[PDB]
């Protein structure tokens, strides 16, 4: 945060509005009590913006030589095996919760439905997210193996 003194003289004659003229008025007001008291009775707090050239931006942004090469680098295959097995197993356990849920859960009063049938930590949604993340990955996995084989030989 950045600050610039105010003169006591300004505050005594109540001439302080001069310093806060023609502005958007966005002031950080985080931190109060003694700190804020001191600030109001001594300095003025105003915004900080960060300006940078696009030359600077690009140098920083650029990463490794091996960055643009990585797609033919591939995971060790013992880990892909492990991952395939973990996902099939996990969904099974949340699927139990989901079957129990739609036994009933067609009455009334929203919040009660969620406590009765464990609609909190909702199983349908948590399952839909895991199922898809794993599905997309497995497309990437195959894609790399086939390409590696064929491109090189």
């Amino acid at each position: 945060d950045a600050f610039r003194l105010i003169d006591t003289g300004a505050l005594i004659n109540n001439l302080e509005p001069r310093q806060t003229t023609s502005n958007t008025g966005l002031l950080n007001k985080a931190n109060i009590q003694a700190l804020i008291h001191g600030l109001n009775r001594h300095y003025y707090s105003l915004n900080i913006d960060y300006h940078k050239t696009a030359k600077e931006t690009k140098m920083l942004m650029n990463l490794h030589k091996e960055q643009w090469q990585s797609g033919l680098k591939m995971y060790d295959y013992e880990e892909k095996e492990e991952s395939n097995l973990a996902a099939t197993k996990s969904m099974v356990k949340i699927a139990e919760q989901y079957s129990k849920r739609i036994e009933e859960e067609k009455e009334l009063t929203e919040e009660e439905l969620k406590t009765r049938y464990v609609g909190r930590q909702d199983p349908k949604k948590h399952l839909s997210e895991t199922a898809d993340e794993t599905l997309e990955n497995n497309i990437v996995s195959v894609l790399t193996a086939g390409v590696n084989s064929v491109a090189i030989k």
Binding site: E81, N84, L85, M91, V92, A95, E96, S99, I102
Partner: protein
């Protein structure tokens, strides 16, 4: 062989004993049967609930 303690097969007309020490079948495919298995129960339930709409 039948107890399973070397679990192989006896080739009678060639009078040789084949021994295979391969453990039980791949885990991954079996775990798929369990996942698909649940899903059938999910669908039966889904149709009853949906009967009201039809």
């Amino acid at each position: 062989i039948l107890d399973k303690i070397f679990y192989g097969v006896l080739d009678q007309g060639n009078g040789w004993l084949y021994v295979y020490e391969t453990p039980n079948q791949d885990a991954t495919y079996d775990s798929a049967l369990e996942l698909v298995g649940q899903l059938n129960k999910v669908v039966d339930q889904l149709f009853e609930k949906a009967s009201v709409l039809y």
